[PDB]
């Protein structure tokens, strides 16, 4: 997808002139560059394809941070985590999607598991993940029967294995994910995306049995939206995030220092 | 199995890769795309939208609408400067425009920019004004005649509301870098071509609002995680 | 990428293997084979040569 060439534009003046408009119409202003420059013809021939949605959305980024410690004293209980799936707590990805009313995409999901040693060695280690759609029984324990997964998407990683990935199709009960919402679940709390965006949760858990090595596991989890579509653009976030689902921005004991920077006088660039 | 052998670049994850991948959720089927209004394919349609510059970026206006606006003084017999700005798309204040942010999400830019201006003062009032552009390698102008040597438009403030005009693309290179460090793209500069004349007992004042958008000429490359916004620490929930 | 899966006999070196391999020295070109006399294709031509037995293999 390309710009047109630009023609040569003859130096002229006339009673006809498009340089004037009514921006108040809502329509964008007097469109044409050849109107006020006596141009030479140029093969303006620079592709917009990097500017495509399947480009701009369609680069991966990190989403969330599954940090865990391997507890010893009840290894069997504690050594798992669960995270509520959202695009709302890493700013760059958030701001890609905080750009529209709604968006739809299939998802590359990519896992960057990392083991950090608090001990002289780590040995072999294996780690489980599960997508927990809502109303799956959430694992309560590193020994919970819920680690069995006859139909839940559960996947494994271990020391020395390559980065896991999967393709997750577009999920919503609706046509597109709400980037924002203007009301409630029907009895009137959780205003906005905390209503609509119940994807349930990701989960993780050490699969190797009790062993002597005190370790931290950290998974950085990444995603890229592809086969994307998006719906009615909306203005970018001006200030630091605060509250995942909620658009809150007035932070506690703080002030609204936006991306705009002041200057001494408006006659000085 | 087929005799195969493995090239470097294997076994990495690249956040900007491109490949097929296996399904986590086979046999699933997505919801149908109903015909929602407000389709989009590219960022350039957002670039085509006129957005206001917060032109008047100072303490006395920043926490308000007024940084989008400038005030004019019908009292003055002078040719002199009303305002000026850079033209580098990710410079202050322009970066804060939506084209600014989209450019700030990018490293290369090209093509001419549309600029637009409404005489927001009292309908009974008249003026003509100079809007001008400075091709760089040179200081920002200090007389109206300097700007008259630059490419410029004189605004016939007729019945029609708005003058709209273009900074021509005059980069040496087909692109320019989106944010300058120790670098420049040129200046917007604005001047009293006539004095502003209100008729008697009108408010001794006028307002001007200023707009920009990408022309049909406009394009970007090297999408990059934008300068414009910062996250400190964890985003709470 | 194409779904692939790996058979045993992978990742070894066998001194008697048979395969393509990548070049250390791409774009290079060898010297031409001039018509040197004394061609050979197989060991059997050497077998066809009469050679003496050291029949009388003793100290003396």
């Amino acid at each position: 997808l390309v710009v047109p060439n630009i023609n040569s534009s003859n130096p002229t003046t006339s009673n006809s002139a498009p340089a004037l408009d009514a921006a108040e119409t809502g329509h964008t202003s007097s469109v044409q560059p050849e109107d006020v420059i006596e141009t030479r013809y140029v093969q303006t021939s620079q592709t917009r394809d990097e500017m495509s949605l399947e480009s701009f959305l369609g680069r991966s980024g990190c989403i969330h941070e599954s940090k865990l410690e391997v507890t010893l004293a009840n290894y069997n209980k504690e050594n798992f985590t669960v995270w509520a799936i959202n695009l709302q707590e890493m700013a760059q990805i958030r701001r890609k999607f905080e750009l529209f009313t709604y968006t739809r995409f299939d998802s590359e999901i990519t896992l960057v598991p990392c083991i950090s040693a608090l001990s002289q060695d780590i040995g072999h280690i294996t780690m489980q993940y599960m997508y927990v759609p809502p109303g799956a029984p959430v694992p309560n324990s590193r020994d919970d029967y819920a680690w069995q997964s006859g139909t839940n998407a559960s996947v494994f990683w271990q020391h020395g294995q390559a980065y896991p990935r999967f393709s997750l199709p577009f999920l919503s009960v609706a046509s597109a994910y709400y980037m924002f919402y203007d009301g409630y679940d029907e009895q009137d709390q959780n205003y906005g995306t905390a209503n609509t965006n119940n994807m349930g949760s990701l989960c993780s858990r050490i699969v190797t049995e009790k062993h002597i090595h005190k370790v931290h596991i950290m998974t950085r989890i990444y995603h890229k939206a592809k086969h994307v579509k998006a719906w009615c653009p909306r203005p970018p976030r001006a200030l630091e995030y605060t509250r995942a689902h909620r658009t809150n921005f007035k932070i506690e004991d703080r002030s609204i220092q936006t991306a705009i920077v002041t200057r001494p006088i408006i006659t000085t660039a | 199995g087929l005799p195969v052998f493995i090239t470097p670049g294997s076994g990495q994850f690249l956040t900007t890769d491109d490949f097929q991948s296996p399904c986590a959720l086979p046999w699933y089927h997505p919801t149908k795309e109903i015909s929602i209004p407000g389709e989009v394919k590219n960022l350039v349609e957002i670039c085509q939208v006129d957005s206001l510059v917060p032109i008047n970026n100072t303490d006395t206006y920043i926490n308000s609408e007024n940084m989008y606006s400038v005030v004019l003084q019908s009292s003055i017999n002078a040719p002199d400067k009303i305002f000026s700005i850079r033209t580098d798309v990710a410079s202050q204040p322009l970066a804060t425009t939506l084209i600014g942010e989209i450019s700030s999400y990018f490293t290369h830019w090209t093509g001419s920019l549309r600029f637009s201006f409404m005489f927001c003062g009292t309908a009974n009032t008249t003026v003509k004004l100079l809007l001008a552009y400075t091709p760089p390698g040179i200081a920002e102008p200090t007389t109206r005649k300097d700007a008259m040597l630059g490419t410029h438009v004189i605004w016939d403030v007729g019945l029609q509301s708005t003058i709209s005009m273009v900074v021509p693309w005059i980069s040496a290179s087909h692109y320019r870098n989106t944010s300058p460090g120790r670098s420049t793209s040129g200046y917007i500069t604005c001047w009293y071509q006539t004095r502003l004349v209100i008729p008697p007992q009108t408010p001794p004042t006028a307002r001007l609002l200023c707009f920009v958008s990408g022309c049909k000429d406009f394009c970007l490359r090297m999408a990059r995680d934008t300068n414009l916004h910062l996250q400190s620490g964890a985003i709470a929930q | 990428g194409l779904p692939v899966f790996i058979t045993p006999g992978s990742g070894q070196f066998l001194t008697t293997d048979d395969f393509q391999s990548p070049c250390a020295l791409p774009w290079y070109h060898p010297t031409k084979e001039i018509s040197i006399p004394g061609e050979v294709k197989n060991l059997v031509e050497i077998c066809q040569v009469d050679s003496l037995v050291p029949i009388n293999n003793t100290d003396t």
Binding site: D106, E108, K224, H227 | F19, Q20, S21, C23 | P3
Partner: peptide, 25 residues
Amino acid sequence: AQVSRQNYFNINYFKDAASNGASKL
């Protein structure tokens, strides 16, 4: 068939179509 912007043939092979995650313009 071959790639329209290009000079070679390549096409899907992974099973379910949504899982591809790579689109034309």
